Amino acid sequence: DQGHYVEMHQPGLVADHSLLSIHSAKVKITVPSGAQVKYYCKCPDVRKGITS
Amino acid sequence: EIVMTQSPATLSVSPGERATLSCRASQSVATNVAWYQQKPGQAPRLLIYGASTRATGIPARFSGSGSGTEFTLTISSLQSEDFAVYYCQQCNDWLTFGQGTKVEIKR
C-alpha cells in the first residue's frame, strides 16, 4: 500500500545520566559520538551539549 | 590530581605576545585543574595571574594572563616585558589536589 501513510516524524531530545562519569575528583562527561549531550551542573555548562 | 608538567617558560626578548605554556601531564591544565596561569614569584605576584587558566587573574600584567592554549595552560605572556619575568606556572589547584604547574617562566 501507499494510499495510507504515516509521517516518520523527526525525533527529539533524550536525557542521560551515565555519560557523567567521575574526574577522580568531580564530574567527568564521557560522550560516545556526536552526542552533544546538554549538561548543566550547578553553573551553566554547555547546555548546547558537547561531544567533548 | 591532574599533574601539570608545565612547559618551562614563556620565550620573549622584545616585548611581545608570548604564552607561558604550562602543560599538564595527566590532562589539560584547565579550570577544573584550576591552573589559573599563575605567575608566581616567591613573594611578588605569587598569585593566580590567570583565572583558572582562562582569564587574567591577580598576578598578571596581562603576562600571566589566563589562557589554556593547549594541554599547556599558557599564562599568556602578552607584551611580555622585563617586569613580566616571573615563573608563570599555571599553578593548578585542582579539585582533588593541587597538581600545580611546575613553572612557565616568562621573561
Side-chain angles (χ1 to χ4, degrees), chain A residues 1-46 49-52, chain B residues 8-9 15-16 19 25 30 34 40-41 43-44 50-51 55 57 59-60 64 66 68 84 98 100:
Chain A
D1 164 278
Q2 193 44 270
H4 305 359
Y5 18 62
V6 183
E7 69 102 355
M8 46 166 164
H9 195 57
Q10 202 96 13
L13 30 77
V14 33
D16 198 67
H17 55 286
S18 305
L19 59 105
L20 305 169
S21 55
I22 198 81
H23 195 46
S24 70
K26 41 146 300 305
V27 309
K28 173 60 150 300
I29 270 211
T30 41
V31 178
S33 62
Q36 288 297 109
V37 284
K38 170 264 203 180
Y39 65 124
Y40 163 74
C41 295
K42 186 250 288 159
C43 100
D45 329 334
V46 184
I50 57 176
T51 313
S52 71

